[PDB]
Amino acid sequence: ATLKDQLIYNLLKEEQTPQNKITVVGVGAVGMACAISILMKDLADELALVDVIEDKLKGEMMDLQHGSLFLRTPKIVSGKDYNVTANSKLVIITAGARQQEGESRLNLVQRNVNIFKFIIPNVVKYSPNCKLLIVSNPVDILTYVAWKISGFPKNRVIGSGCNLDSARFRYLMGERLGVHPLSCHGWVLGEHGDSSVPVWSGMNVAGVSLKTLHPDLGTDKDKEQWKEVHKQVVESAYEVIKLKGYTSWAIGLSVADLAESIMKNLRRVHPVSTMIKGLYGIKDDVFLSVPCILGQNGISDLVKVTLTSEEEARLKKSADTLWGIQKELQF
Amino acid sequence: ATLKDQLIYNLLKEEQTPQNKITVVGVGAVGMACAISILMKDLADELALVDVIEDKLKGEMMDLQHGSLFLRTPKIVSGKDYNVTANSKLVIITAGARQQEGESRLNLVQRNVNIFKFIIPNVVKYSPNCKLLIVSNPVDILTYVAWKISGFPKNRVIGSGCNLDSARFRYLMGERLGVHPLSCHGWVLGEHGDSSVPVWSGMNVAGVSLKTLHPDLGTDKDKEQWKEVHKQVVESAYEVIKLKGYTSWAIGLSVADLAESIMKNLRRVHPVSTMIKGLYGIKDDVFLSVPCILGQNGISDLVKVTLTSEEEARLKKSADTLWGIQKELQF
Amino acid sequence: ATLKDQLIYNLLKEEQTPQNKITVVGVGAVGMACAISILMKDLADELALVDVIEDKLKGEMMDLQHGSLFLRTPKIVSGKDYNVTANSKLVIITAGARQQEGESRLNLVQRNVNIFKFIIPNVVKYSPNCKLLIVSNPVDILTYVAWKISGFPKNRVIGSGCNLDSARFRYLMGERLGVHPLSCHGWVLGEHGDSSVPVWSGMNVAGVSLKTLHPDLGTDKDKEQWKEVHKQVVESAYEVIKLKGYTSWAIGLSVADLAESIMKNLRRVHPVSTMIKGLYGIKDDVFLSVPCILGQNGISDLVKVTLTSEEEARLKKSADTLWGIQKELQF
Amino acid sequence: ATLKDQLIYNLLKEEQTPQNKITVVGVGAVGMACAISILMKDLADELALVDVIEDKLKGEMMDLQHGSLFLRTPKIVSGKDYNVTANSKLVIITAGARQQEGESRLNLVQRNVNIFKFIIPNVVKYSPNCKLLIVSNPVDILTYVAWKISGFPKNRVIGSGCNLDSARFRYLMGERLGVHPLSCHGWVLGEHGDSSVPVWSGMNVAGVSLKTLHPDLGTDKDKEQWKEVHKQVVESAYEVIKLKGYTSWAIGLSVADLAESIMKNLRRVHPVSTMIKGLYGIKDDVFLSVPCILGQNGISDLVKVTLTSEEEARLKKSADTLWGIQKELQF
């Protein structure tokens, strides 16, 4: 008789379906930053890793597995075959197109659409009742792409959007005032990138409107130039890529935070990208970041923020752009 | 329009069942010590409290409910009715017969059976696929009672047993050697109480057999009298009960540790009460503590500890006692 | 040679001062809820318990000790003598008379003033650089008493204040809007009691002013009666005491939350009782809850919350109330 | 009047040193894996990064700082100048030279000695009371190097040693037996690398000696080939490097586990590299992995494992080889 059989008597052989499984698609810096943030927040009873490069994937899986003693996630799996993702509660797409040197914006988006025409159906086939969290950039448009291809209802297709943008706003707001980011409140909404909207009205410490105190907050006659905070937020990624080549930990921590709200059904509010037709004067099938309530059904609700004429027109101008690009995409 | 509807757009009202629900039956010191431990280890997306005293029950629920801002458990419910326990993954029974000043063990058990004849069928009705963790004393006998009434297979009926007895053993072992209890290894097996078997052969730090180093370990010849460590484990509950009237924190943390293993499907080894028929020449339907592997199907496997002839006789003698009581019970 | 000597080589004899030591004065339901909450949030490397009931005190220490296997706080000690508190960063005062059914917090003044004349000098003697977190009621005045007796600067004397009352406000706010309390922002200021001030002008989800959407909010002509939310916050403790005899869990989590911000130097904004002289035209040495920044030096700064003529008047009344009681005290 | 001074009333601009400061030297994959693991286990109130690559260093700093909202470490600083390390409790060294294809072992060590001759005195200058944790390879020798240059007593100079090796040994046990690593007890001692000693005698689940159940375990005629488990431990790093190009997460988690034991004074037993002269007939100043007790003074004690005559010879040969190298180094 075997040592295991001498040591252990077996009552039950057949294991059940995993109950709290998460898949991360793509094992780049962002993918692995999400996985380690998720593994150390104990959100999953099973982690699945998927990417097209077999050796990198098995490597990252074995490195995580070797740390098992220091973790509470008892099964970590990987493969190029999406059968490993079976029965995921949450699937996080970080996989994208490696940006070519002299291509157009439209080229980059359509190469990502071609990768998504493979990933999304494979995700749906093995985890048809899962929430999709789109991290891959450009996040607003690729969240529309994931939506169309998957055929999922709008509540179960979520773009990481202005979540990290808003977390960076609160960090900078915190450094200017000597207050921890947690107690500094402020919202970056609309299109993730240069044309995002800082909501100066909702920007507050302890429910004290910085706009009410300082009427010229966020204007050009602003002597304190608080515009430069949103300018810093919107230029942050560029500055970090400049220095270390990429961004890793901040997005990893922010995606783990979103996963926590989903997996534990918290109904916390996050500024994430959601199909926004019929709201803020938008009449096209586009995704924009607004405060969304995240739980086990994904975006169950969203907050209808009051916006100035300027801010209304900026969200509408971002939608014009996104719809413009989206009708040129080949599905 | 309501402030809520002016503020929030609803995507879907559709509500779902609890995904990681735990129910604690009994809101005495032990039951509430399980609740706060479980609540502060983020093991559940929903917690249900059930006891017979409705005001006490609504007090504890409300007191926990007010801590929500500082918790990651979005739903806390309570009720006399077991419809609030519906869809529980794990159900912990702390409720039981109040110990009469002087009476036989045959009588004390039978008064607990009459209680489990109401508790267990209700639990089974609203949560048919759940795992039962029996904490109520005498834990070994009342785990057999739960098994019989429920009709559940032996894998999904677990008694806390010698799990805390072992935590105490490893704490005291730690004080003697000045090492953390985590790095002190020792096993209390068999019947929870005075008759429990301390396995001296398995007592070690860093895999160094103390029994080999000190052959007298656990004998009456022992110069350092290590039999006192097990004696202290056996008399620990008595000594604490004498000082603060009961035990709370140690059993709450130990059950939460069991709950972690079950809910997160860790597959750790805890010494818990399990149907031990066929093992150690035991011929009767008795439950005793042996090292069991605990996951999302409860006891998947148990460890066959090599015991001395003396150690076997003590387990067989405990089985003759418990079966002697059990066969004279009325269901 | 002993088994311990045969097993372990000693390199150095213990020559180390406590580094992250929290003391809890009082082993009542409040004290032990603070204790377990702090132990399960890994905030301290030494927990010292002090009270006047030597049996109860030793029984609680032993019960915490018996679950050290499941904790990362290696040294738990107790004793009626305050030399156990030596070299504490944070001493949490929960000892003294607690509210009986329907009894005001302002009816515990003279009893707990006497108890603070014993406790505070003893604390100061053994930990003269420690931060005082006052929890005993009436907490606002007893914080002022702790300040006067200790001679400590106002930054190192903190009261639990409206931290829990504010936590409760956001919980009930959350049950109305179907959002997690974490995403529901709103401040209860002034006395931790019946005279507390709900600042309607600061209440927001995602920086959207509820007062601006719903101008009637918190007035008698409000058809949704949002004033009943603040009423519930005031009545909350009375309700819980009536239902289970005391409040323990929620204040334990509220206090561990304040302990986290202090011990980890977060500089988070908490509504805690501090010396409010010079602000809102208050001239006396009054202690009220206003939003404060909490770190390892305690209250480094506070937020000047903008109040409506109505709000400011209602806070000056809460101030007047407490100067009336404070002015006639003996030291 | 600036917005900040309109919003916030300052009491205390007086500032103090951090209390639980950790410094990570080297921002490679290993140092940054330690950084995130330490940040996510809330072990520090200040994290200082120090490397020679100023752009990469500032890049990694900013990437952690942007995730501060999701962290409880309020100050993260970076610089080439070791004045950012001032008042560190624990300084983790991951910086050093990688062996070149032709390079002799002696020459590689001497290149690290020259690097350490700048790093260690700079560390000692700004944190003279700190614990050194040497992760840089070859770990056993560079712990000796760091010890020589620092002038520190042997308790405050720790090599990460066989901590991960042993953690890998317990994973491989776990998969073979279908148990969590936490419940699988095995020890890898001596020189970190292909000469490491797997203590077959100390191999157990629930204190059952596997060597005793299976007499042939760890020998050549072992029908189950358990010797192959140690071979896997010794090759697993080479196999992971071959697949993903380096080792990252498992060493980051393993190091954070040691940081927990030190920063929180747990006194857990870890296989870490310590000055071993006087044990197993070792006459020379060599550092080898033995099971050591780790607290806030580092190695306070160490466990003397009973080894077979064969096993003592393997440590004795490791010592001789290590002294062959160290006696030839230029300090």
DSSP-assigned letters across all residues of B114-174: HHHHHHHHHHHHH-TTPEEEE-SSSHHHHHHHHHHHH---GGGEEE-TTHHHHHHHHHHHH
CA-to-CA distance for A183 and A180, rounded, in angstroms?
6
Residues B315, B304 contacting (CB under 8 angstroms): no
Residues C35, C63 contacting (CB under 8 angstroms): no
Q: How crowded is the C-beta side of D153, counted as CA atoms within 13 Å?
A: 8
**Cβ neighbourhood burial of A129 (10 Å; 0-12, 13-18, 19+):** exposed
Q: At D246, list the tokens.
A: 């380096």
Contact B207 D213 (CB under 8 A): no
Resolution (A): 2.7
Q: Which residues of B touch D213 (CB under 8 A)?
A: 306
3-class state of residue A215 by DSSP: coil
Distances, alpha carbon C58 to alpha carbons A294, B241, B242, C23, C63, in Å: 46, 11, 10, 15, 9
Question: Which uninterrupted H or E stretch holds B38?
Answer: helix B29-39
Residues D160, D90 contacting (CB under 8 angstroms): no
Q: Nearest CA to C31 among C23, C20, C42?
A: C23
Q: Burial letters for C80-91: b for 16+ Cβ neighbours within 10 Å, e otherwise? A: eebebbebbbbb
Question: Which uninterrupted H or E stretch holds B39?
Answer: helix B29-39
**Cβ neighbourhood burial of C175 (10 Å; 0-12, 13-18, 19+):** middle
CA angle B10, B14, B19 (to 5 degrees): 120
CA-to-CA distance for A85 and A78, rounded, in angstroms?
8
Domains present along chain D, CATH in parentheses: 21-159 (3.40.50.720), 163-326 (3.90.110.10)
CA-to-CA distance for B190 and B202, rounded, in angstroms?
15
Instruction: Give the gyration radius of chain A's Cα atoms.
Output: 21
Q: At D20, list the tokens.
A: 């639980």
**Cβ neighbourhood burial of A324 (10 Å; 0-12, 13-18, 19+):** exposed
Tokens 């730690």 label which residue?
B174
Whether residue C291 has a cis bond before it, omega within 30° of 0:
no
Q: Which residues of B touch A9 (CB under 8 A)?
A: 279, 301-304
Q: How far is CA D184 from the centre of its chain?
A: 21
* Active-site position among D185, D192, D230, D270: D192
Other C-beta atoms lying within 10 Å of the C-beta of residue D329? 16
Whether residue B138 has a cis bond before it, omega within 30° of 0:
yes
3-class state of residue B25 by DSSP: strand
Q: At A99, list the tokens.
A: 């940006």
Q: How far is C200 from chain A (nearest CA, A)?
A: 9
Other C-beta atoms lying within 10 Å of the C-beta of residue C167? 24
Strands A90-93 and A204-205: unpaired
| Secondary structure (DSSP) of C167-205 | HHHHHHHHHHHT--GGG-B--EEB-SSTT-EE-GGG-EE
CA angle B194, B198, B203 (to 5 degrees): 155
Q: How far is A323 from chain B (nearest CA, A)?
A: 22
Q: Nearest CA to B20 among D70, A253, A257, A266?
A: A266
Question: Which uninterrupted H or E stretch holds C275?
Answer: strand C268-275
3-class state of residue D72 by DSSP: coil
Strands A90-93 and A21-25: parallel
Question: Which uninterrupted H or E stretch holds B202?
Answer: strand B197-205
User: From its phi and psi, is residue A249 left (phi > 0), alpha (psi between -120 and 50) or beta?
Assistant: alpha
C-chain residue closest to A199, CA distance: C207
CA-to-CA distance for A69 and C329, rounded, in angstroms?
58
Residues A133, A158 contacting (CB under 8 angstroms): yes
Residue D192 appears among annotated catalytic residues: yes
Q: At C88, list the tokens.
A: 């504490």
CA-to-CA distance for B111 and B122, rounded, in angstroms?
18
CA-to-CA distance for C302 and C271, rounded, in angstroms?
9
Please report, to the nearest 10 degrees, the dihedral formed by the alpha carbons of residues B57, B63, B65, B71 taken in order. Answer: -120
Residues C179, A265 contacting (CB under 8 angstroms): no
Question: In what side-by-side order are the strands of the sheet with B287-295?
Answer: A8-10, B298-303, B287-295, B268-275, B157-159, B131-134, B90-93, B21-25, B46-50, B75-78
Q: At A79, list the tokens.
A: 């493969």
Q: At D40, list the tokens.
A: 């996510």
**Cβ neighbourhood burial of B278 (10 Å; 0-12, 13-18, 19+):** exposed
CA-to-CA distance for A15 and B37, rounded, in angstroms?
28
Q: At A12, list the tokens.
A: 């039950």
Residues D165, D231 contacting (CB under 8 angstroms): no
Residues B69, C182 contacting (CB under 8 angstroms): yes
Q: How far is CA A41 from the centre of its chain?
A: 17
Contact B244 C74 (CB under 8 A): no
CA-to-CA distance for A214 and A216, rounded, in angstroms?
6
CA-to-CA distance for B169 and B150, rounded, in angstroms?
32
| Secondary structure (DSSP) of C123-180 | HHHH-TTPEEEE-SSSHHHHHHHHHHHH---GGGEEE-TTHHHHHHHHHHHHHHHT--
Residue A323 identity (one-letter amino acid): W
Q: Is the dihedral of CA D107, D112, D116, D119 positive or negative?
A: positive
Would you give the DSSP letter of residue A72? S
Q: Nearest CA to B162 among A285, C254, D201, D206?
A: D206
Other C-beta atoms lying within 10 Å of the C-beta of residue C229? 22
Phi then psi for residue B273, to 5 deg, are: -70, 125
Residues A322, A286 contacting (CB under 8 angstroms): yes
Residues C66, B172 contacting (CB under 8 angstroms): no
CA-to-CA distance for B46 and B40, rounded, in angstroms?
13
- Structural method: X-ray
Distances, alpha carbon C327 to alpha carbons B29, B281, D68, D141, in Å: 42, 78, 44, 69
CA-to-CA distance for B108 and A315, rounded, in angstroms?
71
Bridge partner residues of B266 (DSSP):
none
Would you give the DSSP letter of residue B272? E
Residues A23, A91 contacting (CB under 8 angstroms): yes
* Active-site position among B192, B214, B230, B270: B192
Question: Which residues are within 8 A (CB) of C101 and not within 5 positions of it... i.e. 6 or more apart?
Answer: C238, C241, C242
Q: Nearest CA to C280 among C249, C303, C250?
A: C303
Residue C178 identity (one-letter amino acid): G
Counting DSSP H helices and E strands in chain D, the numbers are 10, 15
A-chain residue closest to C178, CA distance: A267
Q: Which of D183, D204, D268 sits opposite B180 (nearest CB)?
A: D268
CA-to-CA distance for D252 and D35, rounded, in angstroms?
8
Q: How far is B35 from chain D (nearest CA, A)?
A: 24
Q: Nearest CA to A267 among B126, C177, C261, D74?
A: C177
3-class state of residue C64 by DSSP: helix
Residues D155, D242 contacting (CB under 8 angstroms): no
Q: At D155, list the tokens.
A: 């308790």
Q: Nearest CA to C92 among C19, C8, C172, C30?
A: C30
Phi then psi for residue A218, to 5 deg, are: 85, 0
B-chain residue closest to C184, CA distance: B69
CA-to-CA distance for B21 and B35, rounded, in angstroms?
12
Would you give the DSSP letter of residue A14? P
Distances, alpha carbon D319 to alpha carbons A84, B100, D272, D327, in Å: 46, 66, 15, 12
Bridge partner residues of B272 (DSSP):
B290
Strands A131-134 and A157-159: parallel
Q: Nearest CA to D287 among D162, D103, D112?
A: D162
Contact A4 D70 (CB under 8 A): no
Residues B301, B293 contacting (CB under 8 angstroms): yes
Other C-beta atoms lying within 10 Å of the C-beta of residue B87? 17
Q: How far is A176 from chain B (nearest CA, A)?
A: 27
CA diameter of chain C: 84
Contacts 24+ apart (CB under 8 A), D117-124: D117/D149, D117/D331, D119/D25, D119/D93, D119/D95, D120/D146, D120/D149, D120/D150, D121/D149, D121/D150, D122/D82, D122/D85, D123/D23, D123/D25, D123/D82, D123/D85, D123/D88, D123/D91, D123/D93, D123/D150, D124/D150, D124/D151, D124/D152
Tokens 């999304």 label which residue?
A120
3-state secondary structure labels for all residues of D26-38: CCCHHHHHHHHHH
Residues B160, B272 contacting (CB under 8 angstroms): yes
* Active-site position among C185, C192, C230, C270: C192
Tokens 């879907």 label which residue?
B12
Chain A touching partners, 3 or more CB pairs below 8 A: B, C, D
3-class state of residue C19 by DSSP: coil
Q: Nearest CA to D262 among D292, D234, D285, D303?
A: D292
Residue D286 identity (one-letter amino acid): V
Contacts 24+ apart (CB under 8 A), C232-238: C232/C168, C232/C172, C233/C165, C233/C168, C233/C169, C233/C172, C233/C188, C233/C196, C233/C198, C234/C193, C234/C194, C234/C196, C236/B62, C236/B66, C236/C165, C236/C168, C237/C99, C238/C99, C238/C101, C238/C102
Q: At C49, list the tokens.
A: 């318990």
CA-to-CA distance for C308 and D196, rounded, in angstroms?
73
Phi then psi for residue A44, to 5 deg, are: -135, 140
Counting DSSP H helices and E strands in chain A, the numbers are 10, 15
Residues B67, C64 contacting (CB under 8 angstroms): no
Q: Which of A182, A208, A301 sits opposite C268 (nearest CB)?
A: A182
Q: How crowded is the C-beta side of D204, counted as CA atoms within 13 Å?
A: 23
Question: Which uninterrupted H or E stretch holds B29?
Answer: helix B29-39
C-chain residue closest to B36, CA distance: C249
